[PDB]
Design an enzyme around this catalytic site. Structure first.
Site, mmCIF file in Angstrom:
data_model
loop_
_atom_site.group_PDB
_atom_site.id
_atom_site.type_symbol
_atom_site.label_atom_id
_atom_site.label_comp_id
_atom_site.label_asym_id
_atom_site.label_seq_id
_atom_site.Cartn_x
_atom_site.Cartn_y
_atom_site.Cartn_z
ATOM 1 C CG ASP A 1 28.472 16.815 -22.795
ATOM 2 O OD1 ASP A 1 28.276 16.152 -23.323
ATOM 3 O OD2 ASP A 1 27.631 18.343 -22.879
ATOM 4 C CG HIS A 2 31.491 13.320 -21.468
ATOM 5 N ND1 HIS A 2 33.213 13.014 -21.311
ATOM 6 C CD2 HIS A 2 31.082 14.310 -22.484
ATOM 7 C CE1 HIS A 2 33.333 14.033 -22.480
ATOM 8 N NE2 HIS A 2 32.613 14.963 -22.500
HETATM 9 C C1 HEM Z 1 38.024 19.127 -19.602
HETATM 10 C C2 HEM Z 1 37.950 20.172 -20.044
HETATM 11 C C3 HEM Z 1 37.156 20.090 -21.587
HETATM 12 C C4 HEM Z 1 37.466 19.784 -22.448
HETATM 13 C C5 HEM Z 1 39.399 20.507 -22.811
HETATM 14 C C6 HEM Z 1 36.279 19.789 -23.377
HETATM 15 C C7 HEM Z 1 36.694 19.653 -24.689
HETATM 16 C C8 HEM Z 1 35.607 19.817 -25.685
HETATM 17 C C9 HEM Z 1 36.231 19.514 -26.577
HETATM 18 C C10 HEM Z 1 37.804 18.775 -27.737
HETATM 19 C C11 HEM Z 1 35.053 19.243 -27.707
HETATM 20 C C12 HEM Z 1 35.445 18.812 -29.381
HETATM 21 C C13 HEM Z 1 35.116 19.750 -29.992
HETATM 22 C C14 HEM Z 1 34.870 19.713 -31.279
HETATM 23 O O1 HEM Z 1 35.461 19.640 -32.150
HETATM 24 O O2 HEM Z 1 33.753 20.250 -31.606
HETATM 25 C C15 HEM Z 1 34.218 19.564 -26.809
HETATM 26 C C16 HEM Z 1 32.566 19.206 -26.844
HETATM 27 C C17 HEM Z 1 31.613 18.749 -25.692
HETATM 28 N N1 HEM Z 1 32.263 19.080 -24.435
HETATM 29 FE FE1 HEM Z 1 33.841 20.150 -23.948
HETATM 30 N N2 HEM Z 1 35.281 19.986 -22.953
HETATM 31 C C18 HEM Z 1 35.463 20.100 -21.661
HETATM 32 C C19 HEM Z 1 34.894 20.146 -20.642
HETATM 33 C C20 HEM Z 1 33.391 20.889 -20.379
HETATM 34 C C21 HEM Z 1 32.442 21.061 -20.473
HETATM 35 C C22 HEM Z 1 32.787 21.749 -19.096
HETATM 36 C C23 HEM Z 1 31.336 20.828 -21.032
HETATM 37 C C24 HEM Z 1 30.052 21.442 -19.785
HETATM 38 C C25 HEM Z 1 29.432 21.328 -18.812
HETATM 39 C C26 HEM Z 1 31.455 20.457 -22.051
HETATM 40 C C27 HEM Z 1 30.375 20.192 -23.053
HETATM 41 C C28 HEM Z 1 30.894 19.148 -24.176
HETATM 42 C C29 HEM Z 1 29.495 19.017 -25.022
HETATM 43 C C30 HEM Z 1 28.244 19.418 -24.898
HETATM 44 C C31 HEM Z 1 30.670 18.888 -25.907
HETATM 45 C C32 HEM Z 1 29.734 18.500 -27.621
HETATM 46 C C33 HEM Z 1 29.637 16.608 -27.079
HETATM 47 C C34 HEM Z 1 29.367 15.317 -28.036
HETATM 48 O O3 HEM Z 1 28.686 15.448 -28.446
HETATM 49 O O4 HEM Z 1 30.088 14.870 -28.915
HETATM 50 N N3 HEM Z 1 33.006 20.721 -22.119
HETATM 51 N N4 HEM Z 1 34.095 19.414 -25.409
HETATM 52 C C1 LIG Z 2 36.226 6.993 -30.627
HETATM 53 N N1 LIG Z 2 36.404 7.781 -30.400
HETATM 54 C C2 LIG Z 2 36.747 8.802 -31.323
HETATM 55 C C3 LIG Z 2 36.761 9.874 -30.833
HETATM 56 C C4 LIG Z 2 37.738 10.013 -29.407
HETATM 57 C C5 LIG Z 2 37.807 10.781 -28.645
HETATM 58 C C6 LIG Z 2 38.226 10.176 -26.744
HETATM 59 C C7 LIG Z 2 38.470 11.358 -25.566
HETATM 60 C C8 LIG Z 2 38.431 12.168 -26.177
HETATM 61 C C9 LIG Z 2 37.995 13.221 -27.972
HETATM 62 C C10 LIG Z 2 38.298 14.811 -27.716
HETATM 63 O O1 LIG Z 2 38.033 14.929 -27.492
HETATM 64 C C11 LIG Z 2 36.108 15.937 -26.727
HETATM 65 C C12 LIG Z 2 35.397 15.231 -27.848
HETATM 66 C C13 LIG Z 2 34.610 14.645 -28.244
HETATM 67 N N2 LIG Z 2 33.461 15.092 -29.024
HETATM 68 N N3 LIG Z 2 33.191 15.924 -27.027
HETATM 69 C C14 LIG Z 2 34.090 16.694 -25.506
HETATM 70 N N4 LIG Z 2 34.146 16.591 -24.145
HETATM 71 N N5 LIG Z 2 34.916 17.065 -23.313
HETATM 72 N N6 LIG Z 2 36.234 16.464 -24.387
HETATM 73 C C15 LIG Z 2 35.627 16.071 -25.617
HETATM 74 C C16 LIG Z 2 37.415 11.945 -28.945
HETATM 75 N N7 LIG Z 2 36.955 8.515 -29.300
#
Ligand code: HEM
Ligand SMILES: Cn1ccc(-c2cccc(COc3cc(N)nc4nn[nH]c34)c2)n1
Ligand SMILES: CC(=O)N[C@@H]1[C@@H](O)[C@H](O)[C@@H](CO)O[C@H]1O
Ligand SMILES: CC(=O)N[C@@H]1[C@@H](O)[C@H](O)[C@@H](CO)O[C@H]1O
Ligand SMILES: CC(=O)N[C@@H]1[C@@H](O)[C@H](O)[C@@H](CO)O[C@H]1O
Ligand SMILES: CC(=O)N[C@@H]1[C@@H](O)[C@H](O)[C@@H](CO)O[C@H]1O
Ligand SMILES: CC(=O)N[C@@H]1[C@@H](O)[C@H](O)[C@@H](CO)O[C@H]1O
Ligand SMILES: CC(=O)N[C@@H]1[C@@H](O)[C@H](O)[C@@H](CO)O[C@H]1O
Ligand SMILES: CC(=O)N[C@@H]1[C@@H](O)[C@H](O)[C@@H](CO)O[C@H]1O
Ligand SMILES: OC[C@H]1O[C@@H](O)[C@@H](O)[C@@H](O)[C@@H]1O
Ligand SMILES: OC[C@H]1O[C@H](O)[C@@H](O)[C@@H](O)[C@@H]1O
Ligand SMILES: OC[C@H]1O[C@H](O)[C@@H](O)[C@@H](O)[C@@H]1O
Ligand SMILES: C[C@@H]1O[C@@H](O)[C@@H](O)[C@H](O)[C@@H]1O
Ligand SMILES: [Ca+2]
Ligand SMILES: [Cl-]
Lengths: 465, 103
Positions: free
Chosen positions: B94-95
């Site tokens: 995803d990253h």
């Molecule tokens: C380590 C456990 C995880 C944490 C703590 C985590 C945390 C987050 C957080 C905080 C965000 C941004 C939330 C927001 O403010 O809208 C995020 C976005 C995202 N996460 Fe998770 N995530 C985790 C695991 C995963 C997993 C397992 C997947 C899928 C397999 C995933 C897919 C996504 C996707 C697609 C986004 C949006 C990314 C973007 O375009 O910025 N995450 N996640």
């Molecule tokens: C340049 N800069 C701006 C914000 C950040 C930053 C760096 C590490 C964690 C977080 C918050 O955590 C997530 C955000 C997200 N959009 N998608 C995710 N998926 N897993 N964790 C997520 C934001 N860097």
């Protein structure tokens, strides 16, 4: 203005208000912090608000390399013509590499532990440090680049600093595609959707849009349902490595000190392979570690990740559940009885119908994760469609896709198909007992575990010049 | 766009030769359906107190979480056929695909 400490709704803030009688927040004036996503067009009243993807949609391992030219350079080891990626010059993991450190103003990792004073790491993606299990995968992939660069340098000493980086980068991205489509995706979709949304690859298609769909960003957050409330650390005999073998997830987020000063990547990977994932159930969706204690160590309050996902989908102005069911050509439930039939759980249909009023209003992640899982798959038919549709586009719309004519030779392709992530663990860590194929299925020791010798390595003979 | 190219660019630029910013970095998300907002163009549903969505009131995400996502952690059903590594690769993949930047 300042989303971090203020509960006022002035742009770019969109704070999540607290409902009456909340299990955690007794302060009703208080709220969950929220920064609206950046507009692709700030200030416009003609364009319908859309958002930006700061990354390359391609399965090119951009989280390793970088999606921006300055960061691609400030990540490479420029001191030599061995074309490796720069590493931590202050810390090591039993002589093995550690991702470098990032110079940050508002460093979140430092707030997890003052005494240790360990900052965030530096990878091609800002989110490398968010969790040690993610730092682990990140550390493994960088190690495997320098490991390939070396194995290519001794094969072709007549190759310069740029050629080495590019050729190992090529192989890295290809290993990301191989593990994604051959190993990960079938176990995400199930066999049915895997044949529907991803039929046998033919050849690159320039008419297939390879961008990420605004929906995919919220839909692919299905993985939040597979989250274990503890970080599982395991010794070289796959037993609870003390102290702290089950460390609560609210104390692992951003805690980079746990990698550097608490065992390194090796106990994290072992625990990754040997611990089961959380199972998404209609009555057990996601854990309270991410629902009540998200980034609790670094923030004025712990966030609710499942709620963020929902507000984020509204911020991204996403059409609800029924719009997407239709997009996918799946039936659209209009009442509790109909939704009850769709979900194969009337209790859930009624609870959602009470909140939303109609399934039309059901937030895409909420409805997607509420649906019952497919046969041998970890999502329902809606997410299978959104996810599948996207991965089809990223595969056929990738001109540097591993199977595509010209990217690699008939020979290299044969060599590359022998790769697997356990094999990547064998060569970049001090782990000898590994997850027997398929790595994503296998979760019990030693029942599903094998030795490093029983796995064939990637022959780089076809790569010789 | 160069006529002949051996490797990928760092920004994703030039992967499609016809539309060279397709899949490339720091560019807008493709939309598979039109966006849905209170004002129809910017303000998210939930924004204005009072304003309903498709005839119905807008449910607080925190409340939807409290009422549909919450459960007691002791009850957690572990998956038999899936490892925690499965959850972990999804995040890593995803990253490689998306990052919606915030202010
Ligand atoms: C380590 C456990 C995880 C944490 C703590 C985590 C945390 C987050 C957080 C905080 C965000 C941004 C939330 C927001 O403010 O809208 C995020 C976005 C995202 N996460 Fe998770 N995530 C985790 C695991 C995963 C997993 C397992 C997947 C899928 C397999 C995933 C897919 C996504 C996707 C697609 C986004 C949006 C990314 C973007 O375009 O910025 N995450 N996640
Ligand atoms: C340049 N800069 C701006 C914000 C950040 C930053 C760096 C590490 C964690 C977080 C918050 O955590 C997530 C955000 C997200 N959009 N998608 C995710 N998926 N897993 N964790 C997520 C934001 N860097
Ligand atoms: C940033 C980086 O990788 N610097 C290194 C140095 O640590 C090392 O002694 C050598 C190994 O090839 O190459 C250079
Ligand atoms: C330098 C330092 O403080 N090291 C510590 C030590 O105090 C203790 O054995 C443990 C738990 O508190 O964590 C580590
Ligand atoms: C509160 C906390 O995280 N404490 C730990 C501590 O047990 C140990 O002294 C230290 C090493 O510097 O890492 C920190
Ligand atoms: C971008 C593009 O060419 N899309 C077309 C599509 O609209 C048409 O339905 C289909 C069948 O020939 O091929 C595809
Ligand atoms: C020969 C071939 O594969 N053609 C397809 C065409 O039907 C379609 O327009 C487009 C995306 O659907 O990809 C191309
Ligand atoms: C935007 C939308 O709803 N599109 C869908 C389409 O993708 C599908 O083929 C069909 C079945 O519902 O009708 C239309
Ligand atoms: C996980 C695994 O395969 N462990 C093995 C064990 O079963 C075997 O008896 C031995 C020699 O063959 O090496 C070790
Ligand atoms: O691509 C989205 C989906 O929309 C619906 C149908 O058009 C299918 O052919 C497709 O699976
Ligand atoms: O069913 C929806 C639709 O999905 C896609 C193609 O596989 C079509 O043949 C199919 O009918
Ligand atoms: O909109 C993109 C995507 O969803 C719809 C369908 O008609 C598909 O064939 C197409 O690839
Ligand atoms: C990637 C391809 O492009 C479009 C469609 O016409 C095909 O079904 C497929 O999705
Ligand atoms: Ca990418
Ligand atoms: Cl450093």
């Amino acid at each position: 203005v300042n989303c971090e400490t203020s509960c006022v709704q002035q742009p770019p803030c969109f704070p999540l208000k607290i409902p009456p009688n909340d299990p955690r927040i007794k302060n009703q004036a208080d709220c969950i912090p929220f920064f609206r996503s950046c507009p692709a067009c700030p200030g416009s009243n003609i364009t319908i608000r859309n958002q930006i993807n700061a990354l390359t949609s391609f399965v090119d391992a951009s989280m390793v390399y970088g999606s921006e030219e300055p960061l691609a350079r400030n990540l490479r080891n420029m001191s030599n013509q061995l074309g490796l990626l720069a590493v931590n010059q202050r810390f090591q993991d039993n002589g093995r590499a550690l991702l470098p450190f990032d110079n940050l103003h508002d460093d979140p990792c430092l707030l997890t532990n003052r005494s240790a004073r360990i900052p965030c790491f530096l990878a091609g993606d800002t989110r490398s440090s968010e969790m040690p299990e993610l730092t682990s995968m990140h550390t493994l992939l960088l190690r495997e680049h320098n490991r390939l660069a070396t194995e290519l340098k001794s094969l072709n000493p007549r190759w310069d600093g740029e050629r080495l980086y590019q050729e190992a980068r090529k192989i890295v991205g290809a290993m990301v595609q191989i593990i994604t489509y051959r190993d990960y995706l079938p176990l995400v979709l199930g066999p049915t959707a895997m044949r529907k949304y991803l039929p046998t690859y033919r050849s690159y298609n320039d008419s297939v849009d390879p961008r990420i769909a605004n929906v995919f960003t919220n839909a692919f957050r299905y993985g939040h349902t597979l989250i274990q409330p503890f970080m599982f650390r395991l010794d070289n005999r796959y037993q609870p490595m003390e102290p702290n073998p089950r460390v609560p997830l609210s104390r692992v987020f951003f805690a980079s000190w746990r990698v550097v000063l608490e065992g390194g990547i090796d106990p994290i990977l072992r625990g990754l392979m040997a611990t089961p994932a959380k199972l998404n159930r209609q009555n057990q969706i996601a854990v309270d570690e991410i629902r009540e204690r998200l980034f609790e160590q670094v923030m004025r309050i712990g966030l609710d990740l499942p709620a963020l996902n929902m507000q984020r989908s509204r911020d991204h102005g996403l059409p609800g559940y029924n719009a997407w069911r239709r997009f996918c050509g799946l039936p659209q439930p209009e009442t509790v009885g109909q939704l009850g039939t769709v979900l194969r759980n009337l209790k859930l249909a009624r609870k959602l119908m009470e909140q939303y009023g109609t399934p039309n209003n059901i937030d895409i992640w909420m409805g997607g994760v509420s649906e019952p899982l497919k046969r041998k798959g970890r999502v329902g038919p809606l997410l299978a469609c959104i996810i599948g549709t996207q991965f089809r586009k990223l595969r056929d719309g990738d001109r540097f896709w591993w199977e595509n004519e010209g990217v690699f030779s008939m020979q290299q392709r044969q060599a590359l198909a022998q790769i697997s992530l356990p094999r990547i663990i064998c060569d970049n860590t001090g782990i000898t007992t590994v997850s027997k194929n398929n790595i994503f299925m296998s979760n019990s020791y030693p029942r599903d575990f094998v030795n490093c010798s029983t796995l064939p390595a990637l022959n780089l003979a076809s790569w010789r010049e | 766009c160069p006529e002949q190219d051996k490797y990928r660019t760092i920004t994703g630029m030039c992967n499609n030769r016809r539309s060279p910013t397709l899949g490339a970095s720091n560019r807008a998300f493709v939309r598979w359906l039109p966006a849905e907002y209170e004002d129809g163009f910017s303000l998210p549903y939930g924004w204005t107190p009072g304003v309903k969505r498709n005839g119905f009131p807008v449910a607080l995400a925190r409340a939807v979480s409290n009422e549909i996502v919450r459960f007691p952690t002791d009850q957690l059903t572990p998956d038999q056929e899936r490892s925690l590594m499965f959850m972990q690769w999804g995040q890593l993949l995803d990253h490689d695909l998306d990052f919606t930047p915030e202010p």
